[model samples]
Target: TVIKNETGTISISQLNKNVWVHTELGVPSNGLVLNTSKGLVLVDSSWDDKLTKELIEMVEKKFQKRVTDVIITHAHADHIGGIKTLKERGIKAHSTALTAELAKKNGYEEPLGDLQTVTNLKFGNMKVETFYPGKGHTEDNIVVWLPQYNILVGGSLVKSTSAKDLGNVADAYVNEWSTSIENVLKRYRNINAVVPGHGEVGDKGLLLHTLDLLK
Candidate 1:
């Protein structure tokens, strides 16, 4: 799908059943957004200011609602590029303290500016608790817990499919990644779903499988 605005064009593709992958020519990289009752929860943002605004506009048109909170998975450009745009609209942006700190250390601007320390963020009737699963993919990576729905947003630690060797291990805690996955596994017995930063959404078992791959 193509969405046009004053900025430019954005193309969206359905990765699986419920997940969407959006990319704009001038954007940073592929971005993910999940539909929620309160509003849309974005996993990441696009590259530049224009592309980010285009994405926000497109999302509003598609969902008929505004973006309430943006869960930035990490400090990567592709992940945090769209933050300034949302901030303009007064949308709250959240991430781990370590993630925000690292972004600042690396000279990344926006994340340093708008990182709100959130222990638990509420979305309508749903509440998402943030937990840093240690150093996996990045030292500040976190997973969002939707306790009521038994949903775990794994950021980038878990993959939607069985692509084992595809993770960015430069800052990845290969040893700790498995341990983090195990931690999430031990949390909720009825976890109905898992959505990774990349790929499609899948059953909760993906968490265990990701752990297995690392181990």
Candidate 2:
């Protein structure tokens, strides 16, 4: 069941397809839940704990399962806002080492608590590996690779925009960010789809396009 909340000028849609998007926000952010053999795996926890819990409840009611894993793209509040909620439910959460470190250093440790690092994880037949590609949005943004599914969950590293309005660059490592993304593109040979922390999901080519914009 899909629900639409037309509040303010932003209309967010929670779709039945397991992919929901907040379209009215400055940058369109979406969350994805996969109902696999193991259980439910969420790609990113959108902003606000109330809405996050509501969304999770809806998924559970509809699919008859609880979310097992939450892969936080980075330490950004919008990405990690629901960390406590997931942890309270005993869901294992993960992020790159740098992300975790930054989260702790920046006083996000309260919500972060004891998060299970996402160095690498295997869920049923799906395999996920974490790698930090320098920094674009933050110093800890990492990409999650699902080898079995050929899906790369890229954090803020890949932005879809022209040269100038490329978006926020706080704590950004522009040079290294470009290089790391190139390495990621080459490392995954059979990546069929790419999911970003923001913007629409696209092909692996976004890696190259983002690198160009950075240069």
Candidate 3:
């Protein structure tokens, strides 16, 4: 595994041959980086542009490939804060239409409203799928799946194991979080890795744990 964590606030670690997870401090956000045949595809961005730019530089320098696209999982500041940075760099920032509207409402640069409820995107040799399981952490939260790698980037829709409780519920669908989790549980199988929005990386157990918290 190639790990580059020169600073405590930012971290990038390889999950597989062409997959890596990037974590930033602030709210302790987590994102995914995929090295594809053409370039790199990112899951989420950092807390803000500074961190986001730093993350891009890190990944690009490490892989020696530019970031071609980014998948914004939600409208939260931590998730979509780097929309401007991506735009300045001319990277395609993809998100649900609702997420784009929510980002505007939440006072952030809007990402490309291209993703549907279930969108399958092909970036080079990578097959990326995004699924919106009702509503959980936020009305616009979605999970990204790398079917070939069996890795699920749960984003803020799923909680990490270390999270004692759902961190923020102001924009969350509290009553519907469990049902959303169930939707995810039924959709994917044989998941090798699950990455939460915050805290450590976990397995399918993290989804069950999220369900438990909603109980």
Candidate 4:
């Protein structure tokens, strides 16, 4: 499916029966769609409202599924920009409590209120897990893990191997970034496919690369 916006276009690629990755042009970001028996769960919503709507439309048009849940990795605008659009559609969104609080402070109201450091829930027939591995990209930065598929949506905590440097560290915890990734490696060592917040998808080494960059 092709999704166009004021910025550029979004192209979809199915990674597996349970996961699809959508890459946005003009901006360096990727969004994920998880197909479940109940409905679809979307991760991150690209840059703005137009792209977010296009993403939802593309998913529904191609997979015959609507997004019933959204998981925001952090409070970054690029990550949480679509919460308003999703909220208008009545879709519940989940994120770290700190993330929600920070978002509210920044003028965005998220859906989930009972925020916790870690959330493990079932979405459709799949196990969806989110972890706050201390501080990295942001104090509220968290990683989403799909244990059933051995996939890790590292968000901004894990950087792409191709990245020359940590992209945005203005809100980063540089000292704790490496340790945070080390904890992630210990927790989910066997990730088959790792998706960072931006750039291309990679293997387990992406975590190591992120740690290296942190150093």
Candidate 5:
């Protein structure tokens, strides 16, 4: 079900038994909240502190779970703006080493835990993996994979099929974008659903559409 309030439009939909996609309208970004025995693992922080707080509160009040970890997709403001807020709330935030460096350069002060090429993380029975598909929307862009669910959170690296152009290229590697997605496509097989950074979610076609845009 979807709910809208002062914070923004918030929608929660189950991607699988253990994974839920939390979409926010104010910033128009997609975040994944995984139900784990330890607590909840958040994939991205969306736009700002208010939205982040609302997201956390919604999860806590509705799902009765605490946010245990935050996995950032990239250094863009829309993706990692709430890292400081999450840290203030005592939640550990993680991202690629490159993402952390770029986020710092963009004025994000929070310390982000590091993950190299890929990291296998566990939240109870759920397994969340982060993969760096090389450079795409940004040099630090990464996607989160829930192998058990065959759900891939493509972050900004994969664009919605509805997108007319590459959303933001201020920090993009335009020449390498398609190749980066190709890497992701080659590695992740049988992707049941692919969640982009914004817009409607789709299957592996989203990756193909993004590649076509880059080409």
Candidate 6:
């Protein structure tokens, strides 16, 4: 069932047991929500602080739990814009060091630059990992791995199948994107579901579709 469907602001839907997806309508951005024993783990924030704050409240109330950590995929405003809200609530906003630098440089609040090239994190029974497949949509872009659920939050690195072009290549590595996707393909297989930064969620074919758009 979909919750918090205000038709504007934020919309969240349960993807499966203990896992949900949130799309901030302001930017129409997508992110994951994991219901873990420790608390909720958010894959990305909303477009800005107010929306991010509202997004948290929607999930927390529905699940009856607080948010524990937030993982940012890159430094874009649509992704890292809510770092301040997370910090204000004492939530750990995790990201790579490069992302932190760019976030600050881009004027967005910085996230915890504590993630390695490949980092594995656990919360309750959930095994979430972050992988940097090299430069793609942005230099600091990364993807989240949910092995048990076979879900991969591709962030900006992977585009939705509906994407006509590689939207927003202002900070993108156009030439390196295909190779980066290749890296992700080599590293992860059997991804049942893939969440892109925007638009609808799709299967692994989205990665290939992104490769097609690169041509």
Single out the weakest 10-residue window by summed lDDT for candidate 2: 15-24
Candidate 5 local lDDT, 28-82, one digit each (tens) = 7898988899998899976888788888888877678889899988888887778
Query: Model 6 segments beyond 4 Å from truth?
Result: 5-7
Regions of model 5 farther than 4 Å from truth: 3-8
Better of 1 and 2 by lDDT: 1
lDDT of 2 at 211: 75
Models 1 onward score TM values of 0.77, 0.79, 0.96, 0.93, 0.95, 0.97
In candidate 6 the C-alpha lDDT for residue 43 amounts to 95
- What is the per-residue lDDT of model 6 for residues 127-205, given as tens digits with 9 covering 90 to 100? 9999999998999899999999889999888888778867799999999999999998989978899998888889999
The all-Cα superposition gives candidate 3 an RMSD in Å to the true structure of 1.1
Q: Candidate 3, clashing residue pairs?
A: none
Q: What overall lDDT goes with each candidate model? A: 0.67, 0.65, 0.90, 0.81, 0.84, 0.90
Q: Write the per-residue lDDT of candidate 1 for residues 1-215, one digit (tens) a residue.
A: 44445544575655433345565664124455656678876656676567777787788798798877777778766566666787788777676667777766766655533344336766665566777666777777777766666667776778656566636788777788887777777765688877766655677877766766777
RMSD of 2: 3.9
lDDT at position 138, candidate 2: 75
Let me know the TM-score candidate 3 reaches against the reference structure. Answer: 0.96
lDDT of 2: 0.65
The parts of candidate 2 lying over 4 Å away from their true place are 1-26, 110-118, 161-164
**Model 4 agreement with the true structure over 1-215: per-residue lDDT tens digits:** 33444455877778887788877753568768888898888877767777787888877777797788888888877777778888888777887778888888778876475446667879768888888888989988888889988899998887787897887889989999888888888898689989988878898889988877777
User: Pairing residues by index, what is the TM-score of model 4?
Assistant: 0.93
Error of 6 at 209 (Å): 0.4
Give the local distance difference test score of model 4: 0.81
Residue 108 in model 2: lDDT: 65
Which portions of model 4 miss their true places by more than 4 Å? 1-8
